[PDB]
Amino acid sequence: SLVVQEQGSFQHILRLLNTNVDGNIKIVYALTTIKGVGRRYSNLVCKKADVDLHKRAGELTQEELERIVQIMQNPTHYKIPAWFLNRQNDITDGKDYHTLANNVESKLRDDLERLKKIRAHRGIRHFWGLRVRGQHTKTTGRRRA
């Protein structure tokens, strides 16, 4: 029975990773406003961070915001297995990563620039504007954008 009051412990919009996280939506889903974090990740980040899930974003301490922010830096340290991660075994680095925030279009643009610089097919596709995977263009993808 979470019929709970508080007086100032709640606060709408708390900024995380230079993003804008709504305080009225449940934690797990509140955090997903950020690029790079889906519902799978945010369900797991908040588990290791000793955070009560029944809460809304607006609640939770700024040390509980600190636990979650930090775990997202390195999930690989808080017992979060690599197959949960969105940049594993980098092409130019060889380690595991989970890119976040502004850094999503970052390494993504890079990758595309990688098979643009090397001038390969899947990149040439990207460049041209057309599709990258072997699907048909005869009949589909029309109306553009």
Partner: peptide, 30 residues
């Protein structure tokens, strides 16, 4: 090869989308 490909202008998607569609693409009757 690809060097000519990626570096070719007048051959992208803009240059295609710019173009008007042939008026014989909704026509039959043989």
């Amino acid at each position: 090869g690809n060097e000519g490909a990626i570096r070719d202008k007048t051959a992208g998607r803009r240059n295609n989308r710019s173009k008007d569609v042939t008026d014989s693409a909704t026509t039959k009757k043989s």
